Design a protein around this ligand. Structure first.
Ligand SMILES: O=C(O)C(=O)Nc1sc2c(c1C(=O)O)CCNC2
Ligand SMILES: [Cl-]
Ligand SMILES: [Cl-]
Ligand SMILES: [Cl-]
Ligand SMILES: [Cl-]
Length: 295
C-alpha cells in the first residue's frame, strides 16, 4: 500500500533520499529548440526547458517555440500541457497555444508576485470592462465573471480569435495559497481545488489538454498533475495498490524535466493521493469534509 510505504519512509526519514533517486533516474532528452539564441527571451528560467520531443509548437511559421510540454499519460488516458508562467512577451503565445490546442481550462498554481519577485506576467484581465488584446497573435481576452474564495478563485474568460471572430469560454482555476517551492496548506485544500477542476469538465477528453502552470511549470504543476493521474489510475482499476506513484512520476518526467521540485512536495503528493483515494473508492462524504476544513 501507498500508506505503508509512506509510514516506512517517514519513520526512516528517507524522503530526501527517495526524491534524489527519482532525480537520478529521471529521463534526459535534448532541448535544442529551447536553447536556440532566438528563444532566450521566451524562457523564464535557463534550467527549465521543454524536451524537443514533447514540446508544444505554435501554429505560426514565424517562431513556433513556447516553453510548454505535452504530458501524455498513455495508460491513464489523460493529457496535460505544462508550461511556465507567461512572460511579458509570451502572453500572446500563451493564449495562442490555448486556442490552437483547444484547451477548455487553465490551472494556475502560483501568484503573480511571490517572495518579492514577479513569477508570472498578468496574462488575464482583472476587470470586466478592461479586456486584453494580444496584437502579435490577434486574440482578445475578456473577463466574464469571477468567483473568489479563501483558497481558490474561478474565473470565466472569453477568448476570441480576432481573425475569424470565433469565441470560446475558457475556465481559469487559480489556486492562490500554494507557496513557491512549498506545499498547499493541507491535502484537503488541495483536493478541494483539484475536484473543482475535475467537476468543471475541463479534463474531459472531448476537450484539448488542460493547461497547467506555476512559475516554471514543473514544481507545483508537477505535484498537481501527479496527484490527478494517480487518482485517475486508481479510478480506472478501482485498485489503490496497482498505483506506484514513483513510477508514475518517472513516466511523467519523460515529457517534462524536473516535475515536483522538493522532497516535501513528493511527500505531499503521497498525502493527496492517499487522502483522495477515500473518495475514489466510494466515500463521497470525504468531499464535503475537504470543503468543510477548506473554510
Ligand atoms: O512555480 C513552481 O512551483 C516552480 O517549479 N518554480 C521553480 S523551478 C525552478 C525555479 C523556480 C522559481 O519559481 O523560481 C528557478 C530555477 N531552477 C528551477
Ligand atoms: Cl539539449
Ligand atoms: Cl496573482
Ligand atoms: Cl511578495
Ligand atoms: Cl513575468
Amino acid at each position: 500500500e501507498m500508506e505503508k510505504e509512506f509510514e516506512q519512509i517517514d519513520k526512516s526519514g528517507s524522503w530526501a533520499a527517495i526524491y534524489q533517486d527519482i532525480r537520478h533516474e529521471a529521463s534526459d532528452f535534448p532541448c535544442r529548440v529551447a536553447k536556440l539564441p532566438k528563444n532566450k527571451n521566451r524562457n523564464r528560467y535557463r534550467d527549465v526547458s521543454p524536451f524537443d520531443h514533447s514540446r508544444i509548437k505554435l501554429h505560426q511559421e514565424d517562431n513556433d517555440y513556447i516553453n510548454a510540454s505535452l504530458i501524455k499519460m498513455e495508460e491513464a488516458q489523460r493529457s496535460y500541457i505544462l508550461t511556465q508562467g507567461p512572460l511579458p512577451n509570451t502572453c500572446g503565445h500563451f493564449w495562442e497555444m490555448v486556442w490552437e490546442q483547444k484547451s477548455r481550462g487553465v490551472v494556475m498554481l502560483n501568484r503573480v508576485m511571490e517572495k518579492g519577485s514577479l513569477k508570472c506576467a498578468q496574462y488575464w484581465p482583472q476587470k470586466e470592462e478592461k479586456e486584453m488584446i494580444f496584437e502579435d497573435t490577434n486574440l482578445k481576452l475578456t473577463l466574464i465573471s469571477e468567483d473568489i474564495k479563501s483558497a481558490a478563485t474561478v474565473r470565466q474568460l472569453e477568448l476570441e480569435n480576432l481573425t475569424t471572430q470565433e469565441t470560446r469560454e475558457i475556465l481559469h482555476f487559480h489556486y492562490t495559497t500554494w507557496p513557491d517551492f512549498g506545499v498547499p496548506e493541507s491535502p484537503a485544500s488541495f483536493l478541494n481545488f483539484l475536484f473543482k477542476v475535475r467537476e468543471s469538465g475541463s479534463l474531459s477528453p472531448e476537450h484539448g489538454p488542460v493547461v497547467v502552470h506555476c512559475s516554471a511549470g514543473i514544481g507545483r504543476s508537477g505535484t498537481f498533475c501527479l496527484a490527478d493521474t494517480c487518482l485517475l489510475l486508481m479510478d480506472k482499476r478501482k485498485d489503490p495498490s496497482s498505483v506506484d506513484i514513483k513510477k508514475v512520476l518517472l513516466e511523467m518526467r519523460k515529457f517534462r524535466m524536473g516535475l515536483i521540485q522538493t522532497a516535501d512536495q513528493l511527500r505531499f503528493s503521497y498525502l493527496a493521493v492517499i487522502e483522495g483515494a477515500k473518495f475514489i473508492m466510494g466515500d463521497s462524504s470525504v468531499q464535503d469534509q475537504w470543503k468543510e476544513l477548506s473554510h
